[PDB]
Curated annotation (Swiss-Prot), chains A, B:
GO terms for molecular function: NAD(P)H dehydrogenase (quinone) activity; nucleotide binding; quinone binding; sulfide:quinone oxidoreductase activity. GO terms for biological process: aerobic electron transport chain. This is Sulfide-quinone reductase. Belongs to the SQRD family. It catalyses: n a quinone + n hydrogen sulfide + n H(+) = polysulfur(n-2) + n a quinol. Changing S129A: No effect on FAD reduction. Strongly reduced activity with decylubiquinone. Changing H135A: No effect on FAD reduction. Reduced activity with decylubiquinone. It is found in: Membrane. Homodimer. Catalyzes the oxidation of hydrogen sulfide, with the help of a quinone. Consecutive reaction cycles lead to the accumulation of a polysulfide product on the active site Cys residues; these products are released when they exceed a critical length, typically as cyclooctasulfur.
Length: 421, 421
């Protein structure tokens, strides 16, 4: 309302959850902050691959949201938004109720675009997913079924995927788990299929020696790997794969039987956001300026996977660059600061800063991590590392982030750098 | 003087130069800040290996100090301290003049302990050094002489050394330069000798895959490598080497002819500081608390290589852990802050923070860098990286640090992290 702005945060995930706390903290008692999300629980998504192999359970990585945000003065609506009218500034919820906003922060993350590959939906065939805890649990269930009746394994990433790390991570831990169960030698064939132009491209043109180390890693585990691949369909428990050359021409077609499978899908924007006229690019990603503000609607901001970031390269098979946790947090901080500024006359000048990608993958006793910035080479930092410190860091961070999501966030978030001072 | 403390900084190097600026800036016009150093010029020491192979010249990496510090209100005495009387708080200079202090900040760096190995002094035989620009220039001159009359090369690190990186770096660039000159195949034998327990120990129990990558690097260049070595003497242009086992017992003795050689010597504390009774450990390193304050004299502080840091491991052949630039700067900032606090009643509580080692080595088009913290494993960060970004970073940093040393430093020094924001 006038003089008492109502700020709505859409999506309670890695960007959205902290956004709600930061917003309330920044705006104080004289402004209404409402968090709206499809699920009533928060999930720590980097843990999903471990859930998918049964190394973690849902209870460890997920918790109900209401009490934690409400104790902080935040209103929580555990309902999916179906429609957004940017003109009337109304959001229509699943149950038909409508919510008005003065400012909207879109943090809706990815739509998992299984529709890009007929039969690839986890409910349609043997190709599973580890992007959400629901799917990772389903994946593990199917993993157990492969255990009872061994058959070929196919893990990897679809055309248009932008999140490659987890495919490598899942493939490695499955292998690990298969050995630990003394079941590894029961598998007819274990294949890695990716839209990357080469192993360890990772959607970022490689980082450190990601190419050499991931290649060696896959061979070490007896996983046969194909790059420049797109899946055209999953059908009759078979994956139809087309592999191309540098110029897009076909160099082969394969038909791979699948007993157990997991392909990272392409991400698009969620329908209710992509549905807003003139808001998004053709993929359904919100077009924002450097301040995280919609280019079309001055009172709409966005952060997280939901925003559009222009491609910097064009690969034989369509691929995307990942949007990772540290950058997402910077987007969130910028949005909160700039909205607050709006509510006070100023024009917030804060931006998300330098593009970067930071990923940590835990293999059990040790992990791999990378840091790349900025997006194009030659980079200022281009590091791929492997060791125990990586495992320790992942374990530590999951514990930290989850605690933070329960206890509240002021907050210039990452002072993980107090381990220096 | 009373109410107008006179602060003296001893040594104008990596810690001392910035210390003088920071001190003056922190104390202001009502306190006298005097910088005393053996040379009238500053040198950027990480560039010395390149000078030693002729890739850099003295003019690029060194400049006279006086004008830059004096324009900032700092008094500069280009004289070596010979004696320090901590009781009367008097420093005796080479020319016999004496300087009084209320506070003393010792930043004298290492004494190069060539005396540990008879005949190993750069002026005594073929074993050269790249630790100072004087020596690196001498090293290159001798390198040219090897060029005119090819013979065996021996590069490496002495027993008790603590600075291993530069030995690897020098060995690699010599190889590189030898090839570029089409002279590589003229060398009878190219040997790497180190007191490290294994290749890439680096005095820090290895970091990332330093072991594997440096091993491969040496083999790639046709350099034969021996570890667990100590040199007993250099004589008749021969290096006498004893190699031990895990328990110190001898497993062989070698006599290596040397036409061109470069061994990193052990570091001790400089004589005028080691000469202060009860100030230092047996190596001549200043015993300080976490606030950088001498454990014996409340008005004596120290930073840089000059301080003592206890060993965390004991290697078959004596070795030390390096003290590198970022940690040295933190020591400096802490000392300045705590002295200022003293001069105002408070007890400064600032410390240098977490132990760490950060090294960058440029090979020409690309480099290797590492980051390790804290000192003991398992670490929070344990990274060894190689690439163009390393070269770019080294080149950038040398340019930055040298500019900073001419223009002044407030200053919370490293905001190299504004490349994020
Ligand atoms: C398997 C996997 C592993 C990953 N590992 C890492 C890692 O190790 N490090 C790293 O930095 N990044 C990692 N990421 C990348 C990234 O950081 C995550 O994808 C992260 O969760 C994205 O943050 P987000 O806020 O944009 O989207 P999300 O976390 O997916 O949150 C979006 C939210 O909004 C909701 N929503 C969607 N539509 C609606 C609607 N119409 N109405 C209401 N609510 C809606 C959702 O249900 C959800 O809660 C990983 C991603 C995946 C898939
Ligand atoms: C070859 C080499 C390469 C290195 N490369 C790196 C790198 O890439 N990155 C990194 O972080 N570190 C590097 N280091 C390690 C380290 O950071 C340096 O050694 C650094 O210069 C040490 O800082 P300092 O202030 O303690 O000593 P110094 O820089 O040596 O300064 C000490 C000073 O005090 C003086 N002095 C000594 N005795 C007296 C006296 N009696 N009276 C008056 N003045 C005196 C000196 O002449 C000198 O100016 C390298 C070291 C070497 C030898
Ligand atoms: C974070 C996103 C990236 C993708 C997700 C995960 C990908 C899967 C990991 C593959 C790595 C497997 O391969 C593994 O890597 C390194 C190779 O340098 C080796 O480890 C080697 O370097 C490390 C340090 O970095 C040393 O501590 C080690 O002693 C050395 O052998 C391992 O011996 C090898 O088994
Ligand atoms: C900073 C202190 C450390 C010591 C100082 C300097 C030591 C000398 C450097 C030795 C490195 C030489 O060896 C070199 O290393 C890496 C090995 O992973 C290789 O490079 C490999 O990984 C890099 C990324 O990290 C990739 O970009 C590259 O395509 C790949 O081949 C080089 O092909 C090899 O030639
Ligand atoms: Se990733
Ligand atoms: Se990631
Ligand atoms: Se080093
Ligand atoms: Se270093």
């Amino acid at each position: 309302m006038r003089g008492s702005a109502h700020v709505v945060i859409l999506g309670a995930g890695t960007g959205g959850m902290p956004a709600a706390y930061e917003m309330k903290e920044a705006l104080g008692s004289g402004h209404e902050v409402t968090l709206i999300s499809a699920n009533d629980y928060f999930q720590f998504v980097p843990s999903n691959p471990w859930v998918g192999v049964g190394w973690k359970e849902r209870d460890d990585i997920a918790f109900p949201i209401r009490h934690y945000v409400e104790r902080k003065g935040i209103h929580f609506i555990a309902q999916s938004a179906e429609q957004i009218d940017a003109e009337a500034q109304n959001i229509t919820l699943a149950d038909g109720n409508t919510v008005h906003y003065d400012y909207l922060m879109i943090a809706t993350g990815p739509k998992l675009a299984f529709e890009n590959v007929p039969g690839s939906d986890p409910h349609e065939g043997p190709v599973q997913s580890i992007c959400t805890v629901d799917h990772a649990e389903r994946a593990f269930a199917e993993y157990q079924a492969l255990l009872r009746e061994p058959g070929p394994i196919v893990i990897g990433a679809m055309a248009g995927a932008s999140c490659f790390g987890p495919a490598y991570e899942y493939a490695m831990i499955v292998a690990s788990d298969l050995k630990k169960r003394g079941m590894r030698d029961k598998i007819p064939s274990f294949t890695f299929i990716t839209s990357e132009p080469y192993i360890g491209h990772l959607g970022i043109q490689g980082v450190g020696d990601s190419k050499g180390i991931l290649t060696k890693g896959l061979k070490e585990e007896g996983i046969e790997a194909y790059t420049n691949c797109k899946v055209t369909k999953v059908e009759d428990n078979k994956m139809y794969v087309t592999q191309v050359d540098e110029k897009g021409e076909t160099i082969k077609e394969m038909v791979l039987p699948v007993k157990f499978g997991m392909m990272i899908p392409a991400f698009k924007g969620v329908p209710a956001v992509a549905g807003v006229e003139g808001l998004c690019n053709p993929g359904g990603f919100v077009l924002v300026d450097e301040h995280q503000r919609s280019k079309k609607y001055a009172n709409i901001f966005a952060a997280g996977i939901a925003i559009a970031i222009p491609p910097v390269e064009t690969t034989p098979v369509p691929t995307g660059a990942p949007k990772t946790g540290y950058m997402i947090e910077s987007m969130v901080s910028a949005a909160v600061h700039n909205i607050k500024a709006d509510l006070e006359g100023r024009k917030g000048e804060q931006t998300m800063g330098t593009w970067n990608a930071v990923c940590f993958a835990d293999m059990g006793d040790r992990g791999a991590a990378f840091i790349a910035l900025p997006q194009l080479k030659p980079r200022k930092v281009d590091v791929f590392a492997y060791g125990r410190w990586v495992h320790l860091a992942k374990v530590a961070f999951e514990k930290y982030f989850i605690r933070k999501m329960k206890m509240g966030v002021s907050e210039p978030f990452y002072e993980k750098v107090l381990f220096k001072m």
